[PDB]
Hyaluronan lyase
Amino acid sequence: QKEETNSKITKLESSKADKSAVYSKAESKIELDKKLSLTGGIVTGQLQFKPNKSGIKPSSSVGGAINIDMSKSEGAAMVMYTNKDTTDGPLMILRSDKDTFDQSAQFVDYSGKTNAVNIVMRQPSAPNFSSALNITSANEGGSAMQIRGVEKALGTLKITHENPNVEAKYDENAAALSIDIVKKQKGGKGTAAQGIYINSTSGTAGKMLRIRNKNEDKFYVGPDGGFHSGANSTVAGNLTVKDPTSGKHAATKDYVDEKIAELKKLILKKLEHHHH
Amino acid sequence: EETNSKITKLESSKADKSAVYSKAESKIELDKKLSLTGGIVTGQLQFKPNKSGIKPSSSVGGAINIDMSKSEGAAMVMYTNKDTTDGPLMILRSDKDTFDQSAQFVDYSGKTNAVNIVMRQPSAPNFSSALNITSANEGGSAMQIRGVEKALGTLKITHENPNVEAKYDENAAALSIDIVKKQKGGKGTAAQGIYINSTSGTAGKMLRIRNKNEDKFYVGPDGGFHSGANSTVAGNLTVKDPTSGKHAATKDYVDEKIAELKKLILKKLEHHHH
Amino acid sequence: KEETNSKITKLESSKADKSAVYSKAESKIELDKKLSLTGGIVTGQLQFKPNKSGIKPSSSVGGAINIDMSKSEGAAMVMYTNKDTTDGPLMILRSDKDTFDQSAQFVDYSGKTNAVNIVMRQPSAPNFSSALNITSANEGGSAMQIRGVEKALGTLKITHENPNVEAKYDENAAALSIDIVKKQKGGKGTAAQGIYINSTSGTAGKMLRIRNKNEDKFYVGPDGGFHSGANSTVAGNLTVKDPTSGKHAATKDYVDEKIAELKKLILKKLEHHHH
Ligand SMILES: CC(=O)N[C@@H]1[C@@H](O[C@@H]2O[C@H](C(=O)O)[C@@H](O[C@@H]3O[C@H](CO)[C@@H](O)[C@H](O[C@@H]4O[C@H](C(=O)O)[C@@H](O[C@@H]5O[C@H](CO)[C@@H](O)[C@H](O[C@@H]6OC(C(=O)O)=C[C@H](O)[C@H]6O)[C@H]5NC(C)=O)[C@H](O)[C@H]4O)[C@H]3NC(C)=O)[C@H](O)[C@H]2O)[C@H](O)[C@@H](CO)O[C@H]1O
Ligand SMILES: CC(=O)N[C@@H]1[C@@H](O[C@@H]2O[C@H](C(=O)O)[C@@H](O[C@@H]3O[C@H](CO)[C@@H](O)[C@H](O[C@@H]4O[C@H](C(=O)O)[C@@H](O[C@@H]5O[C@H](CO)[C@@H](O)[C@H](O[C@@H]6OC(C(=O)O)=C[C@H](O)[C@H]6O)[C@H]5NC(C)=O)[C@H](O)[C@H]4O)[C@H]3NC(C)=O)[C@H](O)[C@H]2O)[C@H](O)[C@@H](CO)O[C@H]1O
Ligand SMILES: CC(=O)N[C@@H]1[C@@H](O[C@@H]2O[C@H](C(=O)O)[C@@H](O[C@@H]3O[C@H](CO)[C@@H](O)[C@H](O[C@@H]4O[C@H](C(=O)O)[C@@H](O[C@@H]5O[C@H](CO)[C@@H](O)[C@H](O)[C@H]5NC(C)=O)[C@H](O)[C@H]4O)[C@H]3NC(C)=O)[C@H](O)[C@H]2O)[C@H](O)[C@@H](CO)O[C@H]1O
Ligand SMILES: CC(=O)N[C@@H]1[C@@H](O[C@@H]2O[C@H](C(=O)O)[C@@H](O[C@@H]3O[C@H](CO)[C@@H](O)[C@H](O[C@@H]4OC(C(=O)O)=C[C@H](O)[C@H]4O)[C@H]3NC(C)=O)[C@H](O)[C@H]2O)[C@H](O)[C@@H](CO)O[C@H]1O
Ligand SMILES: CC(=O)N[C@@H]1[C@@H](O[C@@H]2O[C@H](C(=O)O)[C@@H](O[C@@H]3O[C@H](CO)[C@@H](O)[C@H](O[C@@H]4OC(C(=O)O)=C[C@H](O)[C@H]4O)[C@H]3NC(C)=O)[C@H](O)[C@H]2O)[C@H](O)[C@@H](CO)O[C@H]1O
Ligand code: NI
């Protein structure tokens, strides 16, 4: 015992941490479990990104406010899933508001051996008016959509219509491609727009329009504009042509009339001076 | 004496080492958690909102919201250099056929292409596309496009020869259409290739075909056509009786002119005297 | 008294020093720098680098990020900008290996509106830009494919709408515009076709049907026969079959043979008439 164990007690009261002024390990676990671990976890509220002088890059490998690199991992980078019956908005939205914006909303830069982007609308229980992909532009200065391919032996755009039913005449009103040409919806007075415009700006040796059925040629328009039709055909009007110079060329009115006039002349000549 | 009270107050009121983290242990535990200023996540981050005030708003909504208004750079980049893998990079999925919104909505103002998909040149050509579209919904068009072009096509397709040699692409086309029966047990099809219409009515050509920018064939708004070269029908062609020199003559026209000449000649024959 | 120096040494041993632990307030400061699972604002780059981390391809539960909206209103993800200009696209998907055997994006959609919907809004000034641009340099495959099963519609539906009230303003426009070009770098030409229509199975339908105000104007039928609904022209000869009906076009052979028959009959009547 002394008078100075009271010094040692005061050193402990001074130098050791009070319970009320620090978190216990259990309180710490509680508070840490409310935070996202780098190894994964479940976010139940809104996660907002608001980068601001944050070194975010445009790079298509290392950029982005979010960047997901799957180079060393199996699996998808990102999945958005819903089994909801109905809801108040789309799964994914990309939006840009300034008409000076000089980049795309979405850029896909794809190397690989399957389809870069693949959009599937599954069979509904009841048919309805909806599409896999809808495109709309209100920009008059540009094509709403552009496609450019380098196919050796295929179409740049390939469209297949497939009968949804087993019965051969169920799809008789359907088409692979349907084109409409309309006046302005709000107060338009008409339109002069064309349906299909085909050109070859460099010049092609190929057929401009080729039609087949069961793989057999039925109708074509050649590079010179001449056509070949494979069956009986009709013009509800006159057909202007060149005068024929071969047996199966269509005859003109001039050709008929000239032939008639030649025969006439020869016969009238024989009539005016036959003797018995 | 009464210092055993003071000792018991310290044993009661002071924190035990075993029951609290050191500063060093705290750093370790904090470094495992994501800083608001950024970090690297190495596991799955799952979003499971549930009565969480998530909105549909195309500016402030989303379980994730990225606003790039005040920042340079991309909002999001998904990248892979992997040789092969077990699934697509991004997937959107909706399971109920009553679902009444889109999987993806792009709302774009700007002066370049809103969405831009590029398939790069492979080492070896293969059957794969930039964009593949499939619908099993018979009540709707698989794809729809609407544009308001002053002087362009709503859809522009260009085919470009992949090779220097002029004939290499002789089996290619800009647009290729096929019309097929149902794959599982179908008995045939009556579907059409191309259906063009103007529901309001157009003064324009329905089909206009050029080569090197010079008109070669067209179909006009009335259905009449102009062909720019020798042509063939493997069959009969029905026309109207000609009323001008270069109109094609009908069988009736030929026969009536033959009959008129006949009549005139037989009349002169039956009635001349010597 | 005397031996409580053991009890003091047990306190010096067992109790935490102030200097070696964070106060509650220091802890709050450090925790407030970290993201709460209930939400918050990230201001730097969030990087995902999974590496033997059990990430799956599943279109319901996979992904380094997975968003399930089954139990919640709202969008899964929103990317927005009101910026004037910037240095790159909002969203980017990129794959580098030409052996890569999956898609960049897969949309598996059931529902009753459009799966993917791309809208280019009206700009202040017309310009050359599109809602959707597609480009392939793969010669072995079609740049784009579409398959549909429509009962009574087109698989691809294209509408051109006049941007202006005046009827002739859009006279150079088209619903579909096709070009056929040689290779840009040193190409010697092309033999590619414009439009190729086929039915591999065989169709009873018209191959090409053109209407104006819903009335048939021109068509090509399943057999290749055409019907044109107005005055028409060939700048050249037209080969046809010899006519066997009144309105069939007459051939040169038909004209010549009928001329020769009449000739024969007349010369015969001439060499044998008597008065
Ligand atoms: C159908 C038809 O006939 N239409 C006619 C028009 O023709 C069309 O023109 C368009 C057009 O050019 O506007 C053509 O589309 C282009 O097609 C190209 C493929 O051949 C696409 O690459 C191009 O898209 C651009 O590609 C850039 C690229 O090279 O990758 C992208 O830029 C990169 O962006 C990323 C992300 O921001 C950056 O990371 C990257 O950078 C580099 O990053 C890195 C790194 O490691 O991350 C390293 C480097 O050091 C960095 O520099 C960018 N790269 C560069 C080079 O800057 C662009 O974002 C992307 O847009 C397509 N162009 C567009 C605008 O879409 C189409 O093929 C034609 O058909 C014709 O123009 C018109 C008038 O004549 O008439 C029409 O009828
Ligand atoms: C090719 C052809 O001829 N087809 C024929 C059919 O024509 C096609 O019709 C479709 C159609 O109408 O179904 C046309 O597609 C529409 O095109 C419009 C452009 O002209 C698009 O805007 C429209 O897309 C819809 O756009 C909505 C919009 O109002 O902009 C979106 O709604 C917004 O969604 C966001 C995100 O969920 C919400 O935030 C927002 O809300 C507001 O939010 C905010 C905010 O700051 O966030 C502020 C406001 O206070 C809130 O109210 C929504 N907006 C509002 C106000 O509701 C939709 O999500 C999006 O769908 C296109 N519509 C569709 C369904 O795709 C196409 O142009 C035509 O070609 C024709 O229908 C048919 C005739 O029988 O025949 C076909 O052959
Ligand atoms: C237009 C035309 O005539 N073109 C023809 C070609 O025709 C086309 O063939 C395509 C083809 O490649 O087969 C057809 O596309 C396929 O369409 C179906 C819908 O009918 C679509 O489902 C295919 O996408 C694939 O879908 C599967 C799926 O089963 O859902 C996806 O796999 C799944 O992935 C998720 C996520 O990773 C997993 O969770 C899930 O477990 C997994 N499921 C399974 C079973 O593994 C897969 O990712 C996806 O590819 C789609 N196929 C492709 C490759 O896109 C197209 O409809 C059709 O028109 C024709 O093939 C050729 C023949 O020479 O000629 C062309 O002219
Ligand atoms: C109304 C009419 O019949 N006009 C007659 C006129 O025919 C028209 O010719 C013009 C033309 O060649 O100038 C055609 O305009 C072309 O239309 C296509 C499709 O809409 C469009 O792609 C062309 O734009 C050019 O093409 C592209 C491209 O990306 O496709 C790039 C060029 O830079 C771009 O400008 C467009 N051409 C122009 C210059 O606008 C129109 O379709 C025809 O109807 C005919 O030539 C003359 C002489 O007989 O008479 C008129 O009455
Ligand atoms: C088999 C055959 O030759 N039928 C003859 C028939 O021609 C058919 O006419 C119908 C019709 O106009 O009623 C055509 O059907 C139309 O086909 C297109 C292309 O698939 C489709 O877009 C039409 O859908 C309508 O489209 C629109 C719209 O504005 O886009 C509005 C409507 O809601 C939508 O349904 C579709 N029309 C309908 C109602 O089915 C068909 O393609 C032609 O083959 C001809 O009219 C009659 C009389 O001479 O004879 C038949 O033999
Ligand atoms: Ni006589």
